[PDB]
Homo-oligomer: A and B are copies of this chain.
Amino acid sequence: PYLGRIEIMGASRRIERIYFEISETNRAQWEMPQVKESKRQFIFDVVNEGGEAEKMELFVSFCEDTIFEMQIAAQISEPFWGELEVQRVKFLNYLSRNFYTLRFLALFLAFAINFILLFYKVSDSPPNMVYYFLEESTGYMEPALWCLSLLHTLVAFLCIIGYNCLKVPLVIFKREKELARKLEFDGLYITEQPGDDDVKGQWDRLVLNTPSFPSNYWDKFVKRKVLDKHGDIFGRERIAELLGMDLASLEDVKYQIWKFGVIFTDNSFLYLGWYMVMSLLGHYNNFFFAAHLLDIAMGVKTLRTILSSVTHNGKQLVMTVGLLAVVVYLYTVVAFNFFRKFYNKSEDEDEPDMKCDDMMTCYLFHMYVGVRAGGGIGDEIEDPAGDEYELYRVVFDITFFFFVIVILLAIIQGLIIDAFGELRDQQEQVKEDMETKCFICGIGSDYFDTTPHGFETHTLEEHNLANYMFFLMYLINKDETEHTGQESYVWKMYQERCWDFFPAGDCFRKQYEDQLS
C-alpha cells in the first residue's frame, strides 16, 4: 500500500528496481476524481497528438503539474489584523474548496432567472414608450427575480475569487516553470532573445529582474544555475544585472504587474470576468441574464462533447459557407444579366418590386430566400412557362437546386457526420494503444501475457505511471543530503533534464528472464 516500486535504467547500465515510501495523503490526492480526470486527459493527449520522442518529457511535465495541484489542494484543505487575516484565509480556502459547487449554483441561478423571465409581457399602457413587466398571478416571481439576480451577481463574484485562489497558482507555476527551462537550457534572453512578435516572451522580460521570480516554481536555484551555465561565456556582470542578483552574496511591483498580466491573459479568467460583467449588466436590463445560458457549453461535458463534433471541422464549415456565397454570387450575376424580368415580387400591377434591378439587392435576395427555400430560387421567382428563355431558366433553377440545396448542404452535414466518427476513432485508437502497449517502456502485451495476467501485473506494479509521479514527488520532498545513491543518480538526471533513466524497450523481466525462469 505505502511501499512504492519503480524501475530505472541504472548507472550500471542495467534495469534497477527502486523502493520508496508513499504517503497516504499523496495516495488519496492521486485517487481524487479531479486528478483521475486530469490523468485521463493527459493520457489521451499524448497517445493521440504526441510523439514517442517527447513522451517522457510530457509525462514529467504532467507529474510536476499534478504535484503542484496536490500541494495546492493540501494547502486549501481544512482539518487585530491577525484575526481578519485568519478569517480571510479561511474564507478563501472555503471558496477554493467549493469553486465547482459555486459554478453549478451559478448555472442553476441563471436557469431560474431565465425561467422567471419567460413571464415578461410588453404593454403600451403602464401596469412613445412601452412598459416591460412580469405578468403572473402568484406574485412571488416579481421579488424572486430581484433576489435571484442579487444572488447570481454575488455567486459570480465568489466564483471569480475562488478561481483566482485555486486555478491561478497552477497557471503561474507553469509559466514560471517554462520560463526557467527556456532560460537555462536555451538561454532565451542570454543567447537568442525572443521572436519580438511573441507577446509572451516580451511580457516575460518584466519578471527576470524581480527578486521573486521562482515564487511558485519549486526550484529556487534557477538563477544560480543559469549564472553558472552562461555567465562564464556571456559576461558574469551582464548575467547578474539581467537576472537582478548581487554577485557579493556568497557569504515586488514588477512581479505583481507581470502576474496580473498573465492572469488577465488567462482564458478561463477572461471567461469568468465576462460572466461577471454580463451578470452586472443584468441589473441594468434583466434580459442580459439570457447570456448566461451559454454557460451550459462549458458546464455540461455531454454538451461539450456534442459541440466538439461541430467544432472539429469548424474551419471547413466556414470554408464551405464561404464557398456557398461565391456560388450564389455567380448565380446572382447570371440572373442580373439575363433573367431580370422574373424577379418581380410585387402582387400590385402598377407598382413593381423588382428584386434584381440592383446587383446588391439581387445578391441579398438570392442569399436570403434561395438558400432557405426547399427547391431553390425557382420556388420564389416567377414561373417561366411559355417564355423564350424557358429552357435556360429551368437549367438555372435545376443547377441551383442541385449545387446549393443538395450538394453544398450535403457537404455541410457530411462534415459533422464525419467528425462524429473521427472522434469515436480517436477514442478507440487511444484505448487500443493503452490496452496493447506499455506506456513507460513500449513493450507489447503479448510478451507479458505468456505469464497469466502478466501485462496486468506489469502495468500495476512494475511500470506504474502513478508510482513514477510518487517517486518524483518523493525526490522533490526529500533532502539532497539525505538522498541515497540511486536517488541521487535519478535526482541528477532530473536536474539535467535527461530522461534516460526511464526504461525504454527493456524491463526487469526481460533482463533477468533466464535467471527467473
Residues of A within 8 A of B (CB): 114, 117-123, 135, 287, 290, 293-294, 296, 300, 302-303, 305-306, 309-310, 315-316, 319-321, 323, 326, 329-330, 333, 336-337, 340, 353, 357-360, 363-364, 367-369, 371-376, 378-379, 385, 394, 397-398, 401-402, 406-407, 409-422, 424, 442, 444, 446, 449-454, 504-505
Contacts and interface: CB of A to CB of B under 8 A. Distances in A.
Number of copies: 2
A301 to B, nearest CB: 10
B118 A359 contact: yes
Contacts of A119: 359-360
A302 to B, nearest CB: 5
A436 to B, nearest CB: 12
Nearest to A114: B329
Contacts of A413: 406, 410, 413-414, 417
Nearest to A374: B374
28 contacts: A114-B329, A117-B333, A118-B359, A118-B360, A119-B360, A120-B336, A121-B359, A135-B358, A290-B329, A293-B329, A302-B315, A303-B319, A306-B316, A306-B411, A310-B407, A368-B378, A368-B394, A372-B375, A373-B374, A374-B374, A407-B412, A417-B417, A417-B418, A417-B420, A418-B420, A418-B421, A449-B505, A453-B504
B416 A420 contact: no
Contacts of A330: 290, 293-294
A359 B422 CA distance: 41
A296 B323 CA distance: 9
Contacts of A410: 412-413, 416-417
Nearest to A394: B368
Contacts of A123: 357
A300 B410 CA distance: 20
Given A114-B329, A119-B360, A378-B372, A424 B422 contact: yes
A415 B309 CA distance: 10
Contacts of A401: 371-372
Nearest to A364: B394
A413 B408 CA distance: 10
A454 to B, nearest CB: 8
A453 B500 CA distance: 11
A309 B414 contact: yes
Contacts of A320: 306
A364 B423 CA distance: 35
Nearest to A402: B321
A109 to B, nearest CB: 16
Given A379-B372, A406-B413, A117 B359 contact: yes
A374 B376 CA distance: 11
A330 B369 CA distance: 23
